[PDB]
Each structure stands twice: as C-alpha cells, then as structure tokens.
Design a protein around this ligand. Sequence first.
Ligand code: HEM
Ligand SMILES: [Ca+2]
Length: 249
Amino acid sequence: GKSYPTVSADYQKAVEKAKKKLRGFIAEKRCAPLMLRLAWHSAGTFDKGTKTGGPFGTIKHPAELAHSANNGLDIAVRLLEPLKAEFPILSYADFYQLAGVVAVEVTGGPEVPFHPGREDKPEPPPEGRLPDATKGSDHLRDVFGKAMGLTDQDIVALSGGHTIGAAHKERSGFEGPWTSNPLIFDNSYFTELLSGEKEGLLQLPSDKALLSDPVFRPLVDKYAADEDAFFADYAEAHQKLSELGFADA
Ligand code: HEM
Ligand SMILES: [Ca+2]
C-alpha cells in the first residue's frame, strides 16, 4: 500500500551522488552501526493510530536528542552535518534514511530499496515510544505491532540489526558487541543468541525474549541456519521501517 511521490530529476541526481559519498564516509569513519542506530531511532517513533513520529528528520532537533533513549546520537547528527551541507536539496529525513541503507550495504548486508521524497516535519514526537531493552515479547509486539504496524517476522529480522555494533555503558548502560565481527553484516547475531552467553558478548533481555516466544523462536532458528533467508526478510523489514508514515496509499 505505497504510492511514492514524484521528485525532480535534480533531486534524484543528488540521491545518487549522496549514496556514493555516504559509502566512502561511513566506511572510512567506521561508523556504520551508529548510522543504522540513527536511522532506526528516527523511524521507530512512528505511531500509526495518531500518525505522529516516524522518519521525518526530527531527530536532529535538540528536544528529540535530549530523549534519554537517544544518548550518543548527537555524535551521529554532527558527523553527518558537513556532508548534508553538500546536498542542500535533500530532506534530512531522506538523508538519514539513506545513511541507514548505506550502513547495511557497506558492512556486506543486503541492498535495501530506497525511495526518496520524505518531507522534514517541524514537531518531534513525545518521548517514550522506543522499545525498552529490559522488557520482553509483549512489549515488543506493543511497540512494533500496535504502534508501528509491523509483523512478527519484521520484529525478528530487524532485531538482527544487532549483528553490527555494540552497546556502551556511558550511553544505554549495557556494554559490548553482540557478535565477534561487529562491523560485518551477517547472521551471527542469531547463532550467538542460540549458543548462549559467552563472556565478552552482549545479549539484551529484549534479544533473549526472541528465544522463548512460540512465533519468534522458529524465525531465529531459520535465520541462524540460512543467512540468505535472513537477508531477504531483513531487506523487506528495513524498507518498511524506513517508510513508516511515508507514501501510504
Ligand atoms: C528490538 C528492540 C531494540 C531494542 C530494545 C534496542 C536497544 C538497543 C540498545 C540498548 C542499544 C545500545 C546503545 C548503546 O549503549 O550504545 C542498541 C544499539 C544498537 N541498535 Fe538496537 N534496539 C532494538 C532494535 C534495533 C533495530 C530495529 C535496529 C536496526 C535495524 C537496531 C540497531 C542497533 C545498532 C546497529 C546498535 C549499535 C550502535 C553502536 O554500535 O553504536 N536496534 N540498541
Ligand atoms: Ca556480525
């Protein structure tokens, strides 16, 4: 149920050029996980019942960066600002979603389709919509299913975003990477979740919740067995996340 907007040829050209510049920058600075986190924190505030929040460029505002879940993302916004300045025609909304797509590509992940045309909105959403790492399955369905409108499959596939990056005790309080190879986008998140706790590696309560829910667990097992199936489901879920509230039929 998407009807994407028309954008000018100049807009399209800037998208193409920004994608290239983002690849080089993200690779050089080793910041793919942070850019994926930025894209996710931008989009995951959407509430389908009120049509508020979502990937509309608001995360750059001080009021939204002040949300406690957003500890550390001020760094991401500042890192990208000089590059955004080379592409004045793009919305911030598009630019941050494009950075998220590129972060997955450059770490070896699937090619997530991208459609331009998000408009920047003035008003940030209220604090509190992003999921709590200490809660379990019911909470995950309330946030991704009831608020965002994604499926059970999308929840499990998107949790695999933790295959890259790490938590920090100065940001969330949790500490360490989920995988041995935190700059490579692979299915290691799921093989680690299955094999249990291992000193040096993180599992959040929210990650463990996938192991004991009757619907999530068979999807974990599938993605741990079959990286290609993970990639296909991941790309569909990321595209839906990046488009919440946008171009809805
Ligand atoms: C399912 C619920 C989720 C919860 C509760 C959650 C929670 C967290 C927490 C607590 C952190 C650590 C922040 C820090 O201390 O630096 C984190 C990091 C991260 N999250 Fe998730 N997250 C979830 C879903 C997602 C999704 C859907 C994505 C993307 C598709 C994502 C991508 C990431 C990445 C890449 C990092 C690492 C950032 C870095 O290395 O600096 N997360 N998340
Ligand atoms: Ca990995």
